[PDB]
Amino acid sequence: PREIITLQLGQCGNQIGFEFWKQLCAEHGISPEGIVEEFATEGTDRKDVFFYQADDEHYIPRAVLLDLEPRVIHSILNSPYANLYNPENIYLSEHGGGAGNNWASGFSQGEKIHEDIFDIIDREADGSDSLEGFVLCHSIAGGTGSGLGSYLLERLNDRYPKKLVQTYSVFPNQDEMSHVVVQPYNSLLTLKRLTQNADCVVVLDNTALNRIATDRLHIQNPSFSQINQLVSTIMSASTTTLRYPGYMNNDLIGLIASLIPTPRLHFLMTGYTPLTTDQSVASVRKTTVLDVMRRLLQPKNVMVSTGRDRQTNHCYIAILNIIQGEVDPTQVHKSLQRIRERKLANFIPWGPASIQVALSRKSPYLPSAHRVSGLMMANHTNISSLFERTCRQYDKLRKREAFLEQFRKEDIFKDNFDELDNSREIVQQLIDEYHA
Amino acid sequence: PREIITLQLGQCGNQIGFEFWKQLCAEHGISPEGIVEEFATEGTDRKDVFFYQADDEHYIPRAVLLDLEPRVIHSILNSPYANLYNPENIYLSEHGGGAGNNWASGFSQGEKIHEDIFDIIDREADGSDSLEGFVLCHSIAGGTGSGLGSYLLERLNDRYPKKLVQTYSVFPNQDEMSHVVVQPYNSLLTLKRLTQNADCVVVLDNTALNRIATDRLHIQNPSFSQINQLVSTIMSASTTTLRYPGYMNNDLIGLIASLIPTPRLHFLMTGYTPLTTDQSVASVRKTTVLDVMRRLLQPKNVMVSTGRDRQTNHCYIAILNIIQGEVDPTQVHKSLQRIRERKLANFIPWGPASIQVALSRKSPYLPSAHRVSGLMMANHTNISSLFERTCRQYDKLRKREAFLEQFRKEDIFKDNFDELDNSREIVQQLIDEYHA
Amino acid sequence: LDVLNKNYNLLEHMQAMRRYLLLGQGDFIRHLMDLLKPELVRPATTLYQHNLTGILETAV
Amino acid sequence: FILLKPVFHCLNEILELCHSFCSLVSQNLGPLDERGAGQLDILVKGFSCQSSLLFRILSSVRNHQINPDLAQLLLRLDYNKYY
């Protein structure tokens, strides 16, 4: 019916998808090894849209996880949520990889394991006779997720041409350049494949993570154990129309169709306010829907590093405001009434704009059926500031003679560096041209 | 009444029929040396249709087992199920054979033991005054089952002309050609006798066995001890209308009459889904009949190596879908309602098609009266892909000068190789011509 | 109002008709309308009804 | 019983007309005889006298104010016939 195959790949893409499947059992009322609660069918009306359909009421995840590093998968099998995963769909015990840290490693390893990489991931494709598409849950940081992920964006474009492609890709961190220095090279090589060899992306910045991780979360030493908490909730938040019973844009080709203006303009800004557990003691007094979307357009919950004074000459075109759970829908048109009076979104002068709001009932659970949740999927034309940030860090590195002799020994014979530079400037010029 | 004599023959045909008789005692509620349970007559309403009729409530099997190799029969008498077999119907102790590995060995040994091979197997023929027919439970692999089995397909065609002939023959393995190399020669010589000297066959591929033997069975080293488990269940599944009390097509000349379009087009595709023991813990919640036949026409349970992209120009003509045991027959017409909406079977444009469904109650046993079972007997015109596979491996071997001097020393004086080639192409041309 | 709740579920059918005629829950109708389109593209014949009854039954 | 006069007369006319297909085939080497094809020519009319009379009831099944259990069964064999 609407079966999606997630493509978890890389050192960071496997960990953000590990707790994504772990989030799904707590809201479906199911255990990874059994069914102890009856809340799975009376409370939740649809479960076989991301999981594989049941053979013994055991909803297998439709997931594949490949990585060169064996460290990310050795921290999985000792956890009690790995018995839900199957040891025959992806790998058996003692799976390995390369050495290995290179963008050209996984780019060259795709055609030597070409027979095996297109054998076991295609067995899940013909399980349903109407496949939705493929989401590449991969990473941009490092050479593991960026090297091999650029290969599958090409060969799955023609072997599966009538399928939706859209990824939840995480952006790397640009604070210092000591541990990694190959960061401007492997990022722009995948970013070219994300626009012409891929339809849509969902950007997730790393410098904007610790802006939120010290905002309300109150940590002193930033660890990697907090990167899975902001990411796994908004992943399950994006499929609330798709997993839980909704009516309009209840498919993944429903939501993405109403937000993309044009190809190579698909970078969607994400926002998510409620992350604090001591808000729970004051939501008993009928906290309404009239105050939760006034702060979405206000740049506080954003996960995109952008300029603060660059929003006057940029214009919103498509903005999504997803409320979940208890909505009190007699005032949801009242919340959309107050949008035109502030004009917090700059509107495009050539065409109409749209503020789309939708709702779906959440899990039968006490932290879910009590507190209001707001998921934002914006589309603003100030996203070229990240593309100006990555390009200015790209041409400055090529004048310092950095990784021009250390990178072209394997499988690179011609200069494909300006092939990425002009196509990035094509994106940056067509964005500002789009508001005439 | 409806007595069938099974002709178990060869190295592989004797082992697949050994556990076929061993399967029948566990479902009849009987022991091979005694009668300890009263479930044989109150639960099962008919038992004397494959067994010989009782003299002391000892249901003798109507079976004969000849082979050149004494190794297959020396692994029988130490098992406690051999006392049900008789040491006077076939052979006494210390029976032997040839040396021996040749198709021309058993083809020449049929007329030197011609007096003894038509003496003791005819004593079981006049036990019932209305004989059903003969099933040749023989093999195609090797020269033992293929050499002698081609002789009895000729001399039993005129000595018993009014009897049904139909075989459950197993196809050999075509993975490498090191241990055996005589595989294209002895297979096509028997395949000519299976079309004009035989009415119907039931094909059983070997390369499709290990496709299923690693699908859900989870083995690492493929042994011969697993080849008897997929075969013995579908043999007893095919006679559920014949052994257990049914109404329509309750004879072996009932089932085969409603599926064969024409002579030399009789190769029936087989399918059987339920082979897993941990499905038992979730069949307690009324698992229905509406989901078990949606996966039969879906090419997952098939035992025939065929092309995946060759089903659009080929058309189904006859498809059998046998449900067993608990059926819940108030929704069995509901399962056949959903067949026309998908059109998963391509229908012939010249004439009508037929989806025949039938039911019979299973054995009074706990793994049998709880779990739904689906037996498929298809007939699709993509079966020429195996005939194109065997013929392309046949003419390529004759240009390499392989077994043209090593095969014509004994009892072969003329070239009968193109006598098998044209008759095989007659089958392959009349199949594609059959849909006008 | 108690005899319907024990036997007939009268106002439960008030909610159940909203999921099909008012199209409350879309997954019942979208998995319908996906399969239902290869039949609606051709003109209707006298052979129309017999596969429409179980293109419903594979959708439900 | 499906219908009193026509369908029971249509159904017993089916079983009579294939009963002479028994007694036609039952000769020694049937399809090579002149009487094998001569007796046949009446039966190739009477077999399509029965499918077309089965076709006449299906128009009374579609244009329907008669009986639902009559219509559900006779169409069930009919999509098992025409498909």
Curated annotation (Swiss-Prot), chains A, B:
Would you tell me the Gene Ontology cellular component terms? Answer: centrosome; cytoplasm; gamma-tubulin complex; gamma-tubulin ring complex; mitotic spindle microtubule; nucleus; polar microtubule; spindle
Q: Which Gene3D superfamilies match?
A: Helix hairpin bin, Tubulin/FtsZ, C-terminal domain, Tubulin/FtsZ, GTPase domain
- Disulfide links within the chain: none
- List the Pfam families hit by this protein, alphabetically: Tubulin (PF00091), Tubulin_C (PF03953)
* Compartment(s) of residence: Cytoplasm, Cytoskeleton, Microtubule organizing center, Centrosome; Cytoplasm, Cytoskeleton, Spindle
Q: Which CDD domains match?
A: gamma_tubulin (cd02188)
What domain of life does the native source organism fall in? Answer: Eukaryota
**What does the similarity note say?**
Belongs to the tubulin family.
According to its UniProt entry, the function of this protein is described as: Tubulin is the major constituent of microtubules. The gamma chain is found at microtubule organizing centers (MTOC) such as the spindle poles or the centrosome, suggesting that it is involved in the minus-end nucleation of microtubule assembly.
What name is this protein filed under? Answer: Tubulin gamma-1 chain
| Native organism | Xenopus laevis
Curated annotation (Swiss-Prot), chain C:
Location within or outside the cell: Cytoplasm, Cytoskeleton, Microtubule organizing center, Centrosome
Superkingdom is Eukaryota
Q: How does it assemble?
A: Interacts with gamma-tubulin.
Task: Please state which protein family the record places this protein in.
Answer: Belongs to the TUBGCP family.
Physiological role: Necessary for the recruitment of gamma-tubulin to the centrosome and for the formation of a functional centrosome.
- What protein am I looking at? Gamma-tubulin complex component 3 homolog
| Species in which this protein is naturally found | Xenopus laevis
> Its gene?
tubgcp3
